[PDB]
Ligand binder design. Structure first.
Ligand SMILES: Nc1ncnc2c1ncn2[C@H]1C[C@H](O)[C@@H](COP(=O)(O)O)O1
Ligand SMILES: Nc1ncnc2c1ncn2[C@H]1C[C@H](O)[C@@H](COP(=O)(O)O)O1
Lengths: 672, 670
């Protein structure tokens, strides 16, 4: 009679509050209704697991070979390990987000083929590659919700290329731009994220015998393929910087604006210096530097060479006010959310592989921060000079379940092992710089989520010195055991990342802080949270230094924290290490609406679940800064602002971030 | 007697772990056992040096002449200089490879007649030619292991021909092919490699089987072993190029097949230009060019004449795809390791003696790059026109020990002196062109070894710019003092190689590069390695230029880097200027096995001893090209491939070598 489903009615009854409190009981009833009145009524029937796999293999849903490395007797034991837990989703959105987005369905995209246990088992069977007892550990890791592989790895593993997130580097030429566009199409379909570095390209007004032209070509190309979006990064000292920023003006033109492309700005310390002392700034025509000095502008140190570019008459320049350009960033970040900011020297001052290259730019989510070398694609393909692009596959720890299971070591190592397997199984063909990077650099991206949810459920405010003290110790341990496993893999395989000999891991310069100072918790309240787990001391780090020195390291880069917008719902976690935007999330379902309380929200902890826009973003910067200490790549840092804040107030946040050693700044969220 | 001997049991304990580390200490015990429990119990007794030398001269072991130039008091002092060093082999394979393969033994191959000190003393007394104080200098040079003469020179010096690298021209005639096989077998008997140039021979179609006929006929003679190997080179603009390449195939048709003979392909820039712009290419019939134009094909210049050959209707041709033919060369090197590529214009752009001839081919090991003129052997002996073939006696210096002792001048000077004495003493009887060229050209091949061993032990990666910076400054200094010694010998002897007056040394074009552009080390880390010895400035080269112009030059060619395989074990050195293959080398002894950690390998320097297969081959090409700047002949350059590389990837590497000025690329290992 009534069209609104019973599970939606029960979900909405959370808000119809009685006593003087919201009915958090009703979401457990709502999810139960979702299963018995819908999900279980739309699951394809099979007699047993034998019939189920044979159906999916023979009808081209699942891949052929990864299953054949196990006997069926062991496959049943692995699947049985997943179902043994009797995992239950605590909320409607948890079950909905999995069964709507992640669970395998029929070709007539209606009926459900995979349960939550079947997905995890298949993914576990893909990672282990024949080791049946390893798959059992991967099942226990993923079903206890200690580890969560990223959207592309978790969705596609086992089916009929897992690594999303690529970063290309374009050289100044038509062959290079045309290939960079063609390679972006191949990597758009394969997963999603493509991020181009346009700092090498020549400015508008330099002839051949600007960068917006390439950004429009990219935007049109990404739109042609209906399929993840792309992005473009540019150095602030580039001439077209203004035209680049004007592509995300709210009052822009139809042809100059880009819809698909996100934009990032790379800011060296020299630009902040000029702003502090109120001097004028000069933006450069990079090809005039190339002809003069031999090297690209983007490859040279601006803190040494800026003055020399100014005094040289052979280099073409453009006078600008840096303080006014910083205001323009803040204006656009308020208006549109873009651009992303990268503080180049805050990345490179703590960077291990500067000898390979300086980190010049970042990816779609401002998280991946690695070295890279430009390619040179010619008419005769056999005369190409292939360089180093960046490709990185992702995954996230669950801070809450890792702490309670006391599995901070094991969860890092299995995650690192699974990420290494995804890296090993990757086969890229039409992107030789991306293929060479995967072989040589062997990069992975182990992040984390559920930081607020953990802190809020233990009565610890996100922006207090307690919360920051916990994160200091927690993420130190993540870095310790990640490095330890990287060396253990390098011993077991006898392989290291290309030019390991030159890195700060090899020279020992990386370990100086961990050898000298002690990162165990100051507050006694937080020391007790790690009870039952050995916190590494300085003496342990000295041994880990010597172990790395002798056996090398397999991974060039290891840790990076992603935004994790969607998979966080599957895990019942607060998204990433960020604070929470809303206590209750009202979202449209389909003419009805759904309400989602944050995980573990109650009258006990209502004020520990403080909304992000109400926080002091200076103290939020302090949290990311203390976490950044023990993450060798970047952290996707969303700023949460109010409509009342001036462009003066935003510059003060952005420059405090730079002052505190923040590597990257993501999307700027603003609220009424 | 029938168990595993103690020295091997100790050697095998290197692979047994202690605290997660190898036992590199155990190999020093393995040598000491090898000496006490074998070598010292299988040396022949002589009471003194006089009775030893008398017995060895009397029983036809040593030669009579070279010893008679000294008095016995002098010979006693020269031997006594060798034993004064107290030289101790550090690893098992160093001592073993010497005493097993080099040290003189009794006629039944059992008991040892020479210690390491005895071998060096005889070689030093041979080289010095009566100068007793120079004999003492040679003993020190070889026993401090600053210099190592080549296998054939080091093994045979002062016993019952020392040169064992030959390159022969072959003219377009059956009668010339008869002597080509005749000479090849005469020179192959003594142990030397013999390379042939088959580019002048007429292709199949032209009447009188082709170049394959000569290779197959030559291969059968070589295959009759009861003595050294053989090779064959062919120009890429010759119609039989594809039949020539088909001999070394995976699915080789037994009629058109070659077991023993190594193969090389000579590639001018004009062929690479045709592949780049993607025009269809024309390979030629050579005897049609000879009749129409009056000269042999590979003597003429392909950059000038390619368009003229295609426009000429009388000259016969055959159209092929150049882009696919480079992919064929890459496929075959991935399969078999052959052919060798010689980038001809990368040789002849820097070649001094073009006026004699352009360099048309190379030797067995793709390193000797010299001028050559074809001979004409006929039915009447007195109407034979004896041309210029190539021989080259070899040697190479130790990069590690030269730098430690700071003897980069003294070693290059003396090594050049020792090679000159072998060059002088050579008496080739049944190869008239090889004899004539030895007298005329007077060329030598001073190389180098232990490059990686040196770099790795000073914390410098092989692929780094720091390494290239060392190589640039090091091999410049070698070339400086080698040219200086050649001019010094030219003044002392009062002699010069035939047509020196026409060379770029005489005209002064050779020194253009060095009179400008200072070749000191850029990096200060590298500059501190040469501390204590003088790095030649541009002004020093300007003075050398004039000294060469006044007094001339004795040697036609002076420097080539050979792939030092067997003798590098004796020196405790990494082979050649190449990178290392295996960190620890496992080889079968005889149902047991032996282990050789690369010399100076330790727990701490492990990652500087990178295995060559793991390296970026583009960065290795840059290292070889850096050295090639200062070596007037070629460098034996093995490319180290993994099986995951496509023909797409290997074709990209071979063209990059061409692009960086590489002269020759050798066997491809996997
Ligand atoms: N909350 C929740 N999460 C996951 N799966 C669920 C849930 N509620 C029911 N179910 C599914 C799982 C089992 O197949 C069955 C058990 O129902 P029951 O009567 O609830 O034990 O229904
Ligand atoms: N490594 C090595 N090389 C050459 N000869 C050796 C070596 N080890 C032992 N010996 C021989 C040489 C002498 O006859 C004696 C000296 O032993 P010593 O203990 O070495 O003083 O042992």
């Amino acid at each position: 009679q009534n069209q609104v489903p019973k599970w939606i009615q029960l979900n909405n009854e959370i808000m119809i509050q009685k006593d003087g409190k919201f009915q958090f009981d009703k979401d457990k009833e709502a999810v139960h209704s979702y299963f018995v009145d819908y999900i279980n009524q739309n699951t394809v029937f099979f007699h047993n697991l034998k019939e189920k796999l044979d159906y999916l293999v023979e009808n081209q849903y699942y891949e052929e070979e990864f299953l054949s490395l196990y006997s069926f007797e062991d496959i049943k034991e692995v699947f049985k390990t997943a179902y043994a837990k009797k995992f239950r989703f605590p909320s409607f959105m948890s079950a909905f987000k999995f069964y709507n987005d992640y669970a395998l369905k029929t070709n007539d995209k209606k009926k459900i083929l995979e349960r939550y246990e079947d997905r995890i088992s298949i993914v576990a069977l893909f990672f282990a590659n024949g080791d049946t007892e390893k798959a059992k550990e991967y099942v226990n890791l993923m079903i206890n919700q200690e580890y969560q592989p990223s959207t592309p790895t978790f969705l596609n593993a086992g089916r009929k290329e897992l690594v999303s997130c690529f970063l290309l580097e374009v050289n100044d030429s038509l062959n290079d731009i045309s290939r960079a566009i063609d390679i972006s199409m191949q990597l758009s379909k394969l997963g999603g994220g493509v991020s181009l570095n346009l700092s090498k390209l020549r400015a508008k007004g330099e002839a051949i015998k600007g960068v917006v032209g390439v950004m429009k070509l990219l935007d049109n190309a990404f739109r042609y393929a209906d399929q993840g979006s792309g992005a473009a990064y540019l150095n602030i000292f580039h001439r077209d910087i203004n035209d680049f920023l004007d592509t995300k003006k709210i009052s822009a033109d139809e042809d100059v604006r880009v819809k698909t492309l996100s934009i990032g700005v790379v800011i060296p310390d020299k630009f902040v210096e000029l702003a502090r002392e109120d001097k004028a700034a000069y933006v450069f025509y990079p090809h005039t530097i190339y002809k003069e000095y031999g090297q690209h502008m983007d490859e040279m140190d601006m803190n040494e060479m800026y003055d020399k570019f100014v005094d040289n008459p052979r280099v073409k320049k453009e006078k600008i006010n840096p303080r006014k350009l910083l205001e323009k960033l803040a204006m656009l970040r308020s208006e549109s959310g873009y651009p992303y900011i990268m503080f180049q020297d805050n990345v490179n001052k703590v960077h291990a592989n500067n000898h390979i290259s300086k980190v010049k730019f970042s990816n779609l989510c401002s998280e991946v921060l690695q070295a890279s070398q430009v390619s040179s694609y010619t008419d005769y393909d056999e005369e190409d000079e292939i360089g180093l692009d960046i490709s990185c596959n992702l995954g996230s720890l669950n801070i809450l379940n890792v702490m309670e299971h006391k599995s901070i070591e094991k969860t890092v190592k299995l995650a690192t092992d699974s990420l290494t397997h995804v890296s090993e199984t990757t086969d890229i063909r039409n992107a030789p710089a991306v293929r060479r990077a995967n072989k040589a650099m062997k990069s992975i991206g182990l992040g984390a989520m559920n930081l607020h949810g953990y802190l809020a459920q233990n009565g610890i405010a996100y922006e207090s010195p307690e919360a920051r003290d916990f994160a200091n110790t927690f993420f130190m341990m993540v870095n310790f055991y990640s490095i330890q496993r990287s060396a253990e893999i390098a011993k077991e395989k006898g392989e290291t990342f290309d030019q390991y000999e030159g890195s700060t891991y090899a020279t020992g310069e990386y370990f100086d802080k961990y050898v000298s100072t002690d990162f165990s918790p100051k507050y006694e309240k937080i020391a007790n949270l790690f009870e039952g787990m050995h916190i590494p001391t300085t003496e342990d780090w000295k041994k880990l230094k010597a172990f790395v020195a002798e056996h090398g390291m397999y991974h060039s880069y290891r840790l990076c924290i992603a935004p994790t917008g969607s998979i966080s719902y599957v895990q019942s976690s607060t998204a990433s290490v960020m604070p929470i935007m809303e206590r209750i999330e009202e979202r449209t379902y389909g003419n009805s609406k759904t309400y989602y309380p944050m995980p573990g929200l109650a009258s006990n902890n209502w004020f520990f679940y403080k909304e992000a826009y109400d926080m002091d973003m200076f103290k939020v910067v302090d949290m990311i800064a203390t976490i950044q200490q023990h993450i060798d790549q970047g952290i996707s840092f969303t700023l949460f602002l109010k409509d009342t804040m001036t462009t003066r107030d935003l510059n003060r946040i952005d420059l405090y971030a730079h002052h505190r050693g923040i590597k990257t700044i993501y999307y700027a969220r603003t609220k009424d």
